Structures are given as structure tokens and as C-alpha cells.
Amino acid sequence: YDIQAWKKQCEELLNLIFQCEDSEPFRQPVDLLEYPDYRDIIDTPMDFATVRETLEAGNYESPMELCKDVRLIFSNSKAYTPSKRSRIYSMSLRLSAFFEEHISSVLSDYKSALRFHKR
Numbered sequence: 001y002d003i004q005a006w007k008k009q010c011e012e013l014l015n016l017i018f019q020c021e022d023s024e025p026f027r028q029p030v031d032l033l034e035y036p037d038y039r040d041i042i043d044t045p046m047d048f049a050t051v052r053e054t055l056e057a058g059n060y061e062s063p064m065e066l067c068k069d070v071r072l073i074f075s076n077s078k079a080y081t082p083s084k085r086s087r088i089y090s091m092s093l094r095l096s097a098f099f100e101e102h103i104s105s106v107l108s109d110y111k112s113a114l115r116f117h118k119r
């Protein structure tokens, strides 16, 4: 029932994601010089360093907000990919599955703690 526990749990999940080779195209903003049409397709860019920095600045109120930004990294990859068989998109699918598998308990524990607090 620790209402604050989600923050360090998310910091540790982010460390695992940064060690995963599949995260490399998503660690920093998409290079607009390499993909000049990126902002014509994507309205809101997102990357793992921005998620980490937002978390570290104390600018997420809940793990649900962090989840929404991580999921935006994956929907952007799905929207920008020219093919569902592309290399970078194939990396985002695996990383999405890894993230969803690990974030489920963080969300569940946080929601459980809030419910206990409301009692």
C-alpha cells in the first residue's frame, strides 16, 4: 500500500529498457534531419530520455501518466513506419511487449494503494 512506490519502480523499469538493444532508436528524439517528413506524420514526438527526465523532475503525478507517454512512443513508431515488417517498428513491438509485461504490476499496486488510502 505504498502510494509513492511506483516512482522508483518506474525508474528501474526505465533502466532495464535503456539496457535493451531494442530501445536504441527510442532513447532520444527521432532525428528530424534523417527523417525530414517525421513531423508531417507525427503530432507529438516522445522518447525514453524525455519520459525519464519528466519522471525525475517530479512532473508525473501517477504511473498512469508515465504509461500514456511510453505508449505514445510505441503508437508514433506504428504510425511512422512505412511497413509493419520494418526493422525499427519490429524493435518497438518487442519493447512494447516487454514494457506492458512489467508495467502491469506497477499500475495494479499503485491503484491498490490509492483504494486502501480512500478506505
Ligand SMILES: Cc1ccsc1C(=O)O
Residues within 6 Å of the ligand: 025, 030, 035, 076, 077, 078, 080, 081, 082, 086, 088, 089, 092
Ligand atoms: C523512427 C522510425 C524510422 C523509420 S520507422 C521508425 C519508427 O519509429 O517506427
